Amino acid sequence: MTSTFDRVATIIAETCDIPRETITPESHAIDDLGIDSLDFLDIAFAIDKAFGIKLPLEKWTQEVNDGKATTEQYFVLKNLAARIDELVAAKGALEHHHHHH
Template identity: 45%
Template structure:
């Protein structure tokens, strides 16, 4: 796994009742890990502090108009971590 994946998984464990062994690259934050909206926002805020970025979680729901937000592909761990890596790289390049 990547460093980002490991950090994200550790923060999920810290801010929720999820066991580390249940988190994999194909885990969906809501459907598989059962993060409710409060857990998800706690995790997002912790990740924003950890990586010094702003995750556009509200936009992800808007981009999927007519689709349930929990179905958003951005909420699969591998996609979520890739998005974090991209945001960190963009910030470093600026």
């Protein structure tokens, strides 16, 4: 299991001084966790380093605000982790499988 959510939940924990374990996959960064979109830029930049991916977070936030998309689709842990995991697979070409404890 490439626990993409797990690593991002840890990043969020470090960001907003909160326990990682209380962040569930269906937690909304803004509505639920009470984390502003500006902090979510820093979170995404920490993901950018961690996974070695380029999150177009600027366009995703723009889609939300311009009614192209809803906030949930990019700012919920399950959806965000899926976006990340797609970009890890796309850049990797080979399988991004990594086992851990």
